[PDB]
């Protein structure tokens, strides 16, 4: 992950996108230090929000705007700059707007069911349209 | 003495390597018996030499071919036709096994 000045220089397209990745890390540090105003699980939601945003930024760079070479993209996935499994989910139908991977796994629920944000809202009552407890997601359904 | 057991444990004194059942060879045993009984294709000889010059390895060479089940050991030579725990300890032939 962390890179030293004596390390192998990253591929050619890295320096154009270095500052925004540094800024992502800056907000991650801010979220780490910021404390309070939530339950034991609620305070840990912005972490997943920012992680999804960064991985989505890299995925957008490669697969929709083609602004980076495949070598640099593979390097970024190797250096944990982006979540490989999350992108793998984004690449298949039905999961285009997946929030995180804890809201898809059924072994982490009480009754072996995916999270509430995964249900399309057309099949969901108005009262139970809430923010996900895992990450604060407000609807992952591709339809929505 | 206290060392003497009241109920003697069951012991099986094994001295040599001896398969319970005849291993499968490339040839049929009836063919070998026919060759031995009614043919002049039998040769009787001994394999002799100095120490560790390789006379048991020579017979291992033929055994590897006629017995497909045998495989080379992990850390040493097969030394088939030793078949004595003493010889397997000293890693040298002490008896003349036919």
């Amino acid at each position: 992950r962390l890179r030293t000045s004596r390390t192998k220089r990253p591929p050619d397209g890295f320096d154009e996108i270095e500052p925004t990745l540094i800024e992502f890390q800056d907000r991650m540090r801010q979220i780490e230090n910021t404390m309070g105003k939530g339950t034991k699980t609620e305070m840990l939601a912005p972490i997943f929000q920012l992680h999804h945003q960064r991985s989505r930024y890299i995925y957008d760079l490669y697969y929709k705007r083609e602004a980076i070479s495949t070598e640099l993209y593979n390097w970024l996935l190797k250096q944990n700059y982006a979540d490989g499994n999350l992108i793998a989910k984004w690449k298949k139908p039905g999961y285009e707007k997946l929030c995180c991977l804890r809201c898809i796994q059924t072994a982490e629920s009480k009754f072996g069911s995916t999270c509430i944000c995964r249900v399309p809202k057309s099949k969901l009552d108005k009262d139970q349209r809430v923010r996900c407890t895992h990450c604060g997601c407000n609807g992952c359904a591709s339809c929505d | 003495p206290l060392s003497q057991p009241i109920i003697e444990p069951i012991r099986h004194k094994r001295i040599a390597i001896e398969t319970t059942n005849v291993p499968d060879t490339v040839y049929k045993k009836e063919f070998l018996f026919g060759l031995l009984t009614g043919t002049d294709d039998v040769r009787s000889f001994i394999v002799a030499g100095h120490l560790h010059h390789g006379k048991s390895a020579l017979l291992d060479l033929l055994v590897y071919y006629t017995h497909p089940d045998t495989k080379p050991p992990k850390r040493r030579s097969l030394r088939y036709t030793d078949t004595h725990y003493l010889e397997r300890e000293r890693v040298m032939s002490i008896k003349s096994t036919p």
Partner: protein, 49 residues
């Protein structure tokens, strides 16, 4: 040829002899590779017999 790590030259030469080895076999320890090559090249030790 077996020892000195020359996969393609050995492969071609044994192809001339119709000795065909699986590709994982060339990636063997030097001694079992020698044993395999010698058991395919020289067959049963018929000279001694």
């Amino acid at each position: 040829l077996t020892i000195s790590d020359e996969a393609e030259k050995l492969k071609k030469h044994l192809s001339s002899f119709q000795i065909y080895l699986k590709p994982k076999d060339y990636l063997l320890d030097p001694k079992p590779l020698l044993q395999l090559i010698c058991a395919s090249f020289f067959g049963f030790p018929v000279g001694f017999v």
